[PDB]
mmCIF file of N, CA and C in Angstrom:
data_model
loop_
_atom_site.group_PDB
_atom_site.id
_atom_site.type_symbol
_atom_site.label_atom_id
_atom_site.label_comp_id
_atom_site.label_asym_id
_atom_site.label_seq_id
_atom_site.Cartn_x
_atom_site.Cartn_y
_atom_site.Cartn_z
ATOM 1 N N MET Z 1 136.724 132.832 56.162
ATOM 2 C CA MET Z 1 137.933 132.332 56.945
ATOM 3 C C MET Z 1 138.093 130.779 56.954
ATOM 4 N N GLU Z 2 139.156 130.195 56.842
ATOM 5 C CA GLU Z 2 139.527 128.748 56.757
ATOM 6 C C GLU Z 2 139.468 128.421 58.083
ATOM 7 N N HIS Z 3 138.901 127.342 58.693
ATOM 8 C CA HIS Z 3 138.928 127.269 60.264
ATOM 9 C C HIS Z 3 139.840 126.227 60.903
ATOM 10 N N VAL Z 4 140.912 126.651 61.087
ATOM 11 C CA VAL Z 4 141.981 125.812 61.574
ATOM 12 C C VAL Z 4 142.891 126.613 62.650
ATOM 13 N N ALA Z 5 143.034 126.127 63.793
ATOM 14 C CA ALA Z 5 143.657 126.838 64.882
ATOM 15 C C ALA Z 5 145.192 126.452 64.847
ATOM 16 N N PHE Z 6 145.877 127.567 65.026
ATOM 17 C CA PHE Z 6 147.332 127.731 65.210
ATOM 18 C C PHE Z 6 147.775 126.549 66.200
ATOM 19 N N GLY Z 7 148.727 125.611 66.010
ATOM 20 C CA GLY Z 7 149.234 124.611 66.771
ATOM 21 C C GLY Z 7 148.476 123.342 66.941
ATOM 22 N N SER Z 8 147.408 123.200 66.108
ATOM 23 C CA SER Z 8 146.633 122.150 66.126
ATOM 24 C C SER Z 8 147.326 120.870 65.808
ATOM 25 N N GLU Z 9 146.972 119.658 66.634
ATOM 26 C CA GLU Z 9 147.902 118.441 66.384
ATOM 27 C C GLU Z 9 147.870 117.799 65.044
ATOM 28 N N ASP Z 10 146.804 118.059 64.226
ATOM 29 C CA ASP Z 10 146.818 117.403 62.823
ATOM 30 C C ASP Z 10 146.854 118.343 61.717
ATOM 31 N N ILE Z 11 147.512 119.456 62.010
ATOM 32 C CA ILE Z 11 147.356 120.652 61.117
ATOM 33 C C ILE Z 11 147.959 120.240 59.728
ATOM 34 N N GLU Z 12 148.944 119.437 59.663
ATOM 35 C CA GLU Z 12 149.526 119.023 58.396
ATOM 36 C C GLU Z 12 148.564 118.251 57.613
ATOM 37 N N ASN Z 13 147.599 117.513 58.089
ATOM 38 C CA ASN Z 13 146.645 116.709 57.345
ATOM 39 C C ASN Z 13 145.492 117.680 56.807
ATOM 40 N N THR Z 14 145.139 118.707 57.718
ATOM 41 C CA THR Z 14 144.186 119.768 57.217
ATOM 42 C C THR Z 14 144.696 120.507 56.057
ATOM 43 N N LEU Z 15 146.040 120.951 56.152
ATOM 44 C CA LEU Z 15 146.350 121.782 55.239
ATOM 45 C C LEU Z 15 146.906 121.052 53.873
ATOM 46 N N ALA Z 16 146.967 119.823 53.910
ATOM 47 C CA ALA Z 16 147.253 118.966 52.776
ATOM 48 C C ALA Z 16 146.296 119.275 51.440
ATOM 49 N N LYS Z 17 145.036 119.684 51.858
ATOM 50 C CA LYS Z 17 143.838 119.890 50.808
ATOM 51 C C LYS Z 17 144.055 121.193 50.384
ATOM 52 N N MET Z 18 144.784 122.085 50.705
ATOM 53 C CA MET Z 18 144.512 123.531 50.490
ATOM 54 C C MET Z 18 145.465 124.017 49.365
ATOM 55 N N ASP Z 19 144.814 124.651 48.280
ATOM 56 C CA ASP Z 19 145.568 125.416 47.293
ATOM 57 C C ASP Z 19 146.002 126.748 47.755
ATOM 58 N N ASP Z 20 146.690 127.505 47.062
ATOM 59 C CA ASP Z 20 147.225 128.876 47.409
ATOM 60 C C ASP Z 20 145.895 129.692 47.908
ATOM 61 N N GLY Z 21 144.876 129.709 47.297
ATOM 62 C CA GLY Z 21 143.793 130.495 47.634
ATOM 63 C C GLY Z 21 143.020 130.121 48.873
ATOM 64 N N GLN Z 22 143.034 128.797 49.234
ATOM 65 C CA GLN Z 22 142.575 128.429 50.696
ATOM 66 C C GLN Z 22 143.529 128.663 51.719
ATOM 67 N N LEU Z 23 144.872 128.584 51.368
ATOM 68 C CA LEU Z 23 145.929 129.255 52.434
ATOM 69 C C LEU Z 23 145.723 130.568 52.786
ATOM 70 N N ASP Z 24 145.437 131.440 51.889
ATOM 71 C CA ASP Z 24 145.100 132.804 52.238
ATOM 72 C C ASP Z 24 143.962 132.986 53.096
ATOM 73 N N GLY Z 25 143.010 132.120 53.308
ATOM 74 C CA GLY Z 25 141.985 132.178 54.336
ATOM 75 C C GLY Z 25 142.338 131.976 55.694
ATOM 76 N N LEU Z 26 143.518 131.358 56.087
ATOM 77 C CA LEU Z 26 143.827 131.083 57.372
ATOM 78 C C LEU Z 26 144.123 132.276 58.303
ATOM 79 N N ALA Z 27 143.894 132.062 59.590
ATOM 80 C CA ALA Z 27 144.061 133.001 60.577
ATOM 81 C C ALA Z 27 145.406 133.454 60.930
ATOM 82 N N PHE Z 28 146.421 132.861 60.445
ATOM 83 C CA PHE Z 28 147.665 133.008 60.965
ATOM 84 C C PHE Z 28 148.615 132.832 59.471
ATOM 85 N N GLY Z 29 149.960 133.207 59.675
ATOM 86 C CA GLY Z 29 150.843 133.206 58.602
ATOM 87 C C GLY Z 29 151.269 131.695 58.469
ATOM 88 N N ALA Z 30 151.451 131.366 57.115
ATOM 89 C CA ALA Z 30 151.770 130.003 56.755
ATOM 90 C C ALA Z 30 152.813 130.065 55.363
ATOM 91 N N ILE Z 31 153.860 129.456 55.652
ATOM 92 C CA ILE Z 31 154.912 129.459 54.682
ATOM 93 C C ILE Z 31 155.325 127.823 54.542
ATOM 94 N N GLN Z 32 155.228 127.452 53.194
ATOM 95 C CA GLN Z 32 155.751 126.062 52.947
ATOM 96 C C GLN Z 32 157.131 126.107 52.334
ATOM 97 N N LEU Z 33 158.123 125.306 52.859
ATOM 98 C CA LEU Z 33 159.452 125.350 52.457
ATOM 99 C C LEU Z 33 159.879 123.962 51.934
ATOM 100 N N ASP Z 34 160.694 124.001 50.979
ATOM 101 C CA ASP Z 34 161.420 122.836 50.576
ATOM 102 C C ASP Z 34 162.523 122.418 51.618
ATOM 103 N N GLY Z 35 163.180 121.325 51.384
ATOM 104 C CA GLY Z 35 164.332 120.910 52.208
ATOM 105 C C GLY Z 35 165.608 121.809 52.234
ATOM 106 N N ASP Z 36 165.788 122.650 51.312
ATOM 107 C CA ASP Z 36 166.759 123.621 51.178
ATOM 108 C C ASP Z 36 166.348 124.924 51.835
ATOM 109 N N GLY Z 37 165.130 125.119 52.229
ATOM 110 C CA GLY Z 37 164.673 126.385 52.524
ATOM 111 C C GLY Z 37 164.024 127.291 51.533
ATOM 112 N N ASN Z 38 163.756 126.810 50.473
ATOM 113 C CA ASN Z 38 163.228 127.695 49.230
ATOM 114 C C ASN Z 38 161.597 127.735 49.526
ATOM 115 N N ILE Z 39 161.090 128.809 49.298
ATOM 116 C CA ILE Z 39 159.828 129.140 49.473
ATOM 117 C C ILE Z 39 158.703 128.526 48.437
ATOM 118 N N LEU Z 40 157.966 127.726 48.661
ATOM 119 C CA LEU Z 40 156.886 127.013 47.930
ATOM 120 C C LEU Z 40 155.501 127.696 47.972
ATOM 121 N N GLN Z 41 155.106 128.048 49.068
ATOM 122 C CA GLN Z 41 153.743 128.647 49.391
ATOM 123 C C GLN Z 41 153.990 129.843 50.424
ATOM 124 N N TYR Z 42 153.069 130.778 50.450
ATOM 125 C CA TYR Z 42 153.395 131.972 51.321
ATOM 126 C C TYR Z 42 152.062 132.748 51.330
ATOM 127 N N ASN Z 43 151.394 132.695 52.425
ATOM 128 C CA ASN Z 43 150.084 133.192 52.515
ATOM 129 C C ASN Z 43 149.915 134.665 52.851
ATOM 130 N N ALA Z 44 148.594 135.174 52.600
ATOM 131 C CA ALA Z 44 148.195 136.564 52.888
ATOM 132 C C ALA Z 44 148.423 136.920 54.158
ATOM 133 N N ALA Z 45 148.107 136.254 55.248
ATOM 134 C CA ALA Z 45 148.376 136.516 56.664
ATOM 135 C C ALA Z 45 149.901 136.830 56.877
ATOM 136 N N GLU Z 46 150.634 135.905 56.466
ATOM 137 C CA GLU Z 46 152.138 136.085 56.423
ATOM 138 C C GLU Z 46 152.416 137.477 55.871
ATOM 139 N N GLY Z 47 151.860 137.860 54.659
ATOM 140 C CA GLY Z 47 152.434 139.170 54.368
ATOM 141 C C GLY Z 47 151.863 140.341 55.031
ATOM 142 N N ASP Z 48 150.639 140.145 55.780
ATOM 143 C CA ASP Z 48 150.153 141.169 56.561
ATOM 144 C C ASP Z 48 151.023 141.516 57.673
ATOM 145 N N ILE Z 49 151.762 140.336 58.288
ATOM 146 C CA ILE Z 49 152.522 140.464 59.346
ATOM 147 C C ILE Z 49 153.937 141.117 58.942
ATOM 148 N N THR Z 50 154.411 140.742 57.840
ATOM 149 C CA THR Z 50 155.929 141.010 57.636
ATOM 150 C C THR Z 50 156.190 142.137 56.626
ATOM 151 N N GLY Z 51 155.108 142.296 55.926
ATOM 152 C CA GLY Z 51 155.071 143.371 54.705
ATOM 153 C C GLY Z 51 155.494 142.725 53.413
ATOM 154 N N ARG Z 52 155.913 141.510 53.312
ATOM 155 C CA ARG Z 52 156.336 141.028 52.157
ATOM 156 C C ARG Z 52 155.288 140.682 51.105
ATOM 157 N N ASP Z 53 155.397 140.815 49.823
ATOM 158 C CA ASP Z 53 154.336 140.478 48.938
ATOM 159 C C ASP Z 53 154.412 139.023 48.660
ATOM 160 N N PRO Z 54 153.387 138.278 48.785
ATOM 161 C CA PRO Z 54 153.485 136.784 48.892
ATOM 162 C C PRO Z 54 153.997 136.230 47.504
ATOM 163 N N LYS Z 55 153.413 136.800 46.346
ATOM 164 C CA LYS Z 55 153.672 136.492 45.062
ATOM 165 C C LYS Z 55 155.114 136.663 44.799
ATOM 166 N N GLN Z 56 155.913 137.661 45.250
ATOM 167 C CA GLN Z 56 157.211 138.013 44.974
ATOM 168 C C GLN Z 56 158.400 137.191 45.748
ATOM 169 N N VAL Z 57 157.810 136.537 46.903
ATOM 170 C CA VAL Z 57 158.971 135.803 47.574
ATOM 171 C C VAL Z 57 158.891 134.352 47.361
ATOM 172 N N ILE Z 58 157.934 133.862 46.575
ATOM 173 C CA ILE Z 58 158.004 132.331 46.037
ATOM 174 C C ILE Z 58 159.209 132.154 45.257
ATOM 175 N N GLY Z 59 159.834 131.165 45.571
ATOM 176 C CA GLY Z 59 161.049 130.723 45.026
ATOM 177 C C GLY Z 59 162.252 131.268 45.426
ATOM 178 N N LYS Z 60 162.151 132.204 46.474
ATOM 179 C CA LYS Z 60 163.470 132.757 47.087
ATOM 180 C C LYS Z 60 163.839 131.802 48.271
ATOM 181 N N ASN Z 61 165.017 131.959 48.481
ATOM 182 C CA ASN Z 61 165.352 131.067 49.705
ATOM 183 C C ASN Z 61 165.174 131.925 51.023
ATOM 184 N N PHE Z 62 164.436 131.285 51.973
ATOM 185 C CA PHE Z 62 163.945 131.880 53.154
ATOM 186 C C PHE Z 62 165.235 132.252 54.124
ATOM 187 N N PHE Z 63 166.056 131.524 54.226
ATOM 188 C CA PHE Z 63 167.289 131.704 55.153
ATOM 189 C C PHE Z 63 168.285 132.534 54.573
ATOM 190 N N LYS Z 64 168.503 132.530 53.444
ATOM 191 C CA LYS Z 64 169.752 133.222 52.733
ATOM 192 C C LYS Z 64 169.124 134.672 52.351
ATOM 193 N N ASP Z 65 167.911 134.752 51.743
ATOM 194 C CA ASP Z 65 167.494 135.909 50.848
ATOM 195 C C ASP Z 65 166.362 136.726 51.761
ATOM 196 N N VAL Z 66 165.315 135.929 52.194
ATOM 197 C CA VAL Z 66 164.362 136.665 52.689
ATOM 198 C C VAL Z 66 164.432 137.145 54.073
ATOM 199 N N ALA Z 67 164.999 136.283 55.011
ATOM 200 C CA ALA Z 67 164.766 136.138 56.495
ATOM 201 C C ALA Z 67 166.121 135.971 57.085
ATOM 202 N N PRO Z 68 167.158 136.726 56.775
ATOM 203 C CA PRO Z 68 168.433 136.564 57.399
ATOM 204 C C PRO Z 68 168.563 136.561 58.781
ATOM 205 N N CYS Z 69 167.467 137.251 59.554
ATOM 206 C CA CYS Z 69 167.492 137.141 61.004
ATOM 207 C C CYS Z 69 167.199 135.804 61.639
ATOM 208 N N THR Z 70 166.672 134.992 60.783
ATOM 209 C CA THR Z 70 166.422 133.529 61.133
ATOM 210 C C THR Z 70 167.570 132.598 60.958
ATOM 211 N N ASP Z 71 168.510 133.200 60.281
ATOM 212 C CA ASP Z 71 169.878 132.316 60.047
ATOM 213 C C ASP Z 71 170.697 132.273 61.316
ATOM 214 N N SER Z 72 170.408 131.363 62.261
ATOM 215 C CA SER Z 72 170.807 131.248 63.543
ATOM 216 C C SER Z 72 170.708 129.950 64.044
ATOM 217 N N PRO Z 73 171.336 129.394 65.103
ATOM 218 C CA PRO Z 73 171.059 128.131 65.482
ATOM 219 C C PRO Z 73 169.556 128.038 66.005
ATOM 220 N N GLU Z 74 169.174 129.263 66.582
ATOM 221 C CA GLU Z 74 167.870 129.147 67.269
ATOM 222 C C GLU Z 74 166.550 128.950 66.312
ATOM 223 N N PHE Z 75 166.694 129.168 64.878
ATOM 224 C CA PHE Z 75 165.765 129.105 64.055
ATOM 225 C C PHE Z 75 166.269 128.142 62.919
ATOM 226 N N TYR Z 76 166.947 128.601 61.959
ATOM 227 C CA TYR Z 76 167.624 127.705 60.911
ATOM 228 C C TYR Z 76 168.187 126.271 61.460
ATOM 229 N N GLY Z 77 168.991 126.558 62.575
ATOM 230 C CA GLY Z 77 169.488 125.296 63.127
ATOM 231 C C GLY Z 77 168.490 124.224 63.494
ATOM 232 N N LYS Z 78 167.407 124.680 63.938
ATOM 233 C CA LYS Z 78 166.322 123.793 64.203
ATOM 234 C C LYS Z 78 165.687 123.222 62.994
ATOM 235 N N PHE Z 79 165.631 124.157 61.827
ATOM 236 C CA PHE Z 79 165.087 123.515 60.639
ATOM 237 C C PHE Z 79 166.125 122.463 60.161
ATOM 238 N N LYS Z 80 167.296 122.958 59.981
ATOM 239 C CA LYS Z 80 168.008 121.778 59.197
ATOM 240 C C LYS Z 80 168.286 120.480 59.928
ATOM 241 N N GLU Z 81 168.175 120.598 61.248
ATOM 242 C CA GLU Z 81 168.185 119.282 62.062
ATOM 243 C C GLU Z 81 166.994 118.611 61.742
ATOM 244 N N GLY Z 82 165.695 119.111 61.698
ATOM 245 C CA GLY Z 82 164.497 118.491 61.311
ATOM 246 C C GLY Z 82 164.649 118.025 59.849
ATOM 247 N N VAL Z 83 165.195 118.511 58.900
ATOM 248 C CA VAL Z 83 165.171 118.067 57.602
ATOM 249 C C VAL Z 83 166.134 116.892 57.638
ATOM 250 N N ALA Z 84 167.189 116.994 58.466
ATOM 251 C CA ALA Z 84 168.341 115.962 58.361
ATOM 252 C C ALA Z 84 167.665 114.656 58.735
ATOM 253 N N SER Z 85 166.901 114.926 59.728
ATOM 254 C CA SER Z 85 166.213 113.807 60.625
ATOM 255 C C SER Z 85 165.077 113.292 60.049
ATOM 256 N N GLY Z 86 164.242 113.969 59.218
ATOM 257 C CA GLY Z 86 163.035 113.575 58.542
ATOM 258 C C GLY Z 86 161.878 113.700 59.604
ATOM 259 N N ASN Z 87 162.037 114.477 60.652
ATOM 260 C CA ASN Z 87 160.913 114.765 61.516
ATOM 261 C C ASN Z 87 161.228 116.127 62.170
ATOM 262 N N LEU Z 88 160.175 116.887 62.417
ATOM 263 C CA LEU Z 88 160.215 118.328 62.781
ATOM 264 C C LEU Z 88 158.944 118.863 63.476
ATOM 265 N N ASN Z 89 158.870 119.145 64.678
ATOM 266 C CA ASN Z 89 157.763 119.804 65.221
ATOM 267 C C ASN Z 89 158.170 120.338 66.361
ATOM 268 N N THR Z 90 158.270 121.914 66.294
ATOM 269 C CA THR Z 90 158.784 122.598 67.474
ATOM 270 C C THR Z 90 158.113 124.029 67.313
ATOM 271 N N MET Z 91 157.967 124.657 68.527
ATOM 272 C CA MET Z 91 157.344 125.935 68.556
ATOM 273 C C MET Z 91 158.040 126.844 69.393
ATOM 274 N N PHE Z 92 158.177 127.965 69.130
ATOM 275 C CA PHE Z 92 159.096 128.864 69.884
ATOM 276 C C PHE Z 92 158.729 130.295 69.733
ATOM 277 N N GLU Z 93 159.148 131.313 70.435
ATOM 278 C CA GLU Z 93 158.894 132.782 70.222
ATOM 279 C C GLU Z 93 160.222 133.229 69.506
ATOM 280 N N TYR Z 94 160.048 134.351 68.684
ATOM 281 C CA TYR Z 94 161.185 134.940 67.827
ATOM 282 C C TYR Z 94 160.725 136.224 67.633
ATOM 283 N N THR Z 95 161.784 137.042 67.307
ATOM 284 C CA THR Z 95 161.548 138.472 66.931
ATOM 285 C C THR Z 95 162.219 138.545 65.399
ATOM 286 N N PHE Z 96 161.124 139.217 64.542
ATOM 287 C CA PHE Z 96 161.454 139.430 63.125
ATOM 288 C C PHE Z 96 161.841 140.799 63.050
ATOM 289 N N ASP Z 97 163.083 141.153 62.451
ATOM 290 C CA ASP Z 97 163.628 142.517 62.595
ATOM 291 C C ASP Z 97 164.307 142.947 61.400
ATOM 292 N N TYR Z 98 164.148 142.219 60.318
ATOM 293 C CA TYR Z 98 165.013 142.720 58.995
ATOM 294 C C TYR Z 98 164.064 143.614 58.076
ATOM 295 N N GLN Z 99 164.464 144.660 58.104
ATOM 296 C CA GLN Z 99 163.825 145.805 57.234
ATOM 297 C C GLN Z 99 162.503 146.031 57.460
ATOM 298 N N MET Z 100 162.131 145.872 58.805
ATOM 299 C CA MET Z 100 160.767 146.089 59.296
ATOM 300 C C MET Z 100 160.904 146.485 60.826
ATOM 301 N N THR Z 101 159.665 147.049 61.107
ATOM 302 C CA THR Z 101 159.548 147.226 62.686
ATOM 303 C C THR Z 101 159.586 145.837 63.384
ATOM 304 N N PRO Z 102 160.610 145.916 64.505
ATOM 305 C CA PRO Z 102 160.675 144.335 65.134
ATOM 306 C C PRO Z 102 159.514 144.082 65.725
ATOM 307 N N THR Z 103 159.010 142.745 65.255
ATOM 308 C CA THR Z 103 157.737 142.221 65.588
ATOM 309 C C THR Z 103 157.931 140.898 66.310
ATOM 310 N N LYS Z 104 157.438 140.685 67.462
ATOM 311 C CA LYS Z 104 157.558 139.572 68.258
ATOM 312 C C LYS Z 104 156.416 138.619 67.632
ATOM 313 N N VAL Z 105 156.921 137.345 67.532
ATOM 314 C CA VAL Z 105 156.053 136.348 66.926
ATOM 315 C C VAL Z 105 156.081 135.026 67.658
ATOM 316 N N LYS Z 106 155.147 134.112 67.479
ATOM 317 C CA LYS Z 106 155.156 132.671 67.884
ATOM 318 C C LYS Z 106 155.295 131.846 66.611
ATOM 319 N N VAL Z 107 156.311 130.946 66.506
ATOM 320 C CA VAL Z 107 156.716 130.221 65.240
ATOM 321 C C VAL Z 107 156.394 128.808 65.589
ATOM 322 N N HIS Z 108 155.720 128.008 64.657
ATOM 323 C CA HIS Z 108 155.552 126.655 64.673
ATOM 324 C C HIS Z 108 155.963 126.121 63.403
ATOM 325 N N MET Z 109 157.259 125.167 63.407
ATOM 326 C CA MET Z 109 157.554 124.409 62.331
ATOM 327 C C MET Z 109 157.251 122.978 62.487
ATOM 328 N N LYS Z 110 156.667 122.412 61.253
ATOM 329 C CA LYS Z 110 156.184 121.111 61.382
ATOM 330 C C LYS Z 110 156.469 120.539 59.974
ATOM 331 N N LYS Z 111 157.027 119.300 59.910
ATOM 332 C CA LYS Z 111 157.108 118.589 58.556
ATOM 333 C C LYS Z 111 155.860 118.406 58.070
ATOM 334 N N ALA Z 112 155.624 118.659 56.685
ATOM 335 C CA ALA Z 112 154.401 118.488 55.966
ATOM 336 C C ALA Z 112 154.191 116.869 55.696
ATOM 337 N N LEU Z 113 152.746 116.655 55.417
ATOM 338 C CA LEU Z 113 152.530 115.301 54.984
ATOM 339 C C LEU Z 113 153.158 114.910 53.554
ATOM 340 N N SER Z 114 153.346 115.995 52.627
ATOM 341 C CA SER Z 114 154.199 115.980 51.532
ATOM 342 C C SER Z 114 155.554 115.262 51.976
ATOM 343 N N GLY Z 115 156.139 114.273 51.324
ATOM 344 C CA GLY Z 115 157.223 114.404 50.501
ATOM 345 C C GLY Z 115 158.268 114.907 51.252
ATOM 346 N N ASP Z 116 159.039 116.033 50.877
ATOM 347 C CA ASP Z 116 160.237 116.669 51.389
ATOM 348 C C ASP Z 116 159.748 118.278 51.365
ATOM 349 N N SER Z 117 158.767 118.363 52.325
ATOM 350 C CA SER Z 117 158.512 119.809 52.483
ATOM 351 C C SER Z 117 158.071 120.141 53.924
ATOM 352 N N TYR Z 118 158.103 121.297 54.361
ATOM 353 C CA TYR Z 118 158.030 121.648 55.832
ATOM 354 C C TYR Z 118 157.248 123.042 55.953
ATOM 355 N N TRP Z 119 156.418 122.973 56.932
ATOM 356 C CA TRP Z 119 155.651 124.269 57.149
ATOM 357 C C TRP Z 119 156.331 125.190 58.234
ATOM 358 N N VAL Z 120 156.082 126.445 58.180
ATOM 359 C CA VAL Z 120 156.512 127.481 59.096
ATOM 360 C C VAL Z 120 155.175 128.269 59.293
ATOM 361 N N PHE Z 121 154.697 128.246 60.581
ATOM 362 C CA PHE Z 121 153.416 128.980 60.843
ATOM 363 C C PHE Z 121 153.806 130.139 61.785
ATOM 364 N N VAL Z 122 152.990 131.286 61.678
ATOM 365 C CA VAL Z 122 153.513 132.260 62.540
ATOM 366 C C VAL Z 122 152.236 133.130 62.879
ATOM 367 N N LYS Z 123 152.269 133.622 64.066
ATOM 368 C CA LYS Z 123 151.107 134.531 64.620
ATOM 369 C C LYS Z 123 151.897 135.545 65.578
ATOM 370 N N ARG Z 124 151.232 136.708 65.707
ATOM 371 C CA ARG Z 124 151.703 137.710 66.644
ATOM 372 C C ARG Z 124 151.382 137.255 68.112
ATOM 373 N N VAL Z 125 152.355 137.774 68.893
ATOM 374 C CA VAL Z 125 152.255 137.714 70.398
ATOM 375 C C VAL Z 125 152.312 138.927 71.191
#
């Protein structure tokens, strides 16, 4: 297991070092998005929570294609304000319910140390 706690203040520095294999060792779901919401990385723990196959959703658009339930002011709205602003750090509870058993989660979105990319971290509550 890769040893990083959900919600850690320096999580974006820790995860900067990790390739897709290391990301699969985390204790929580992790998705890396570009500024348009396209999926760049998607780890094994996220697939365990949601049922999606990580390999298959890379390159899809999270808001339009994969996760329409997050296309709302309460999730996508927060994301797009963060991308526009160039800063994002927000944690909230949400329910994921698209083509799956409704599953309550805690979501943390944070701008990556990269460039123009953004993390979404997910764990069960």
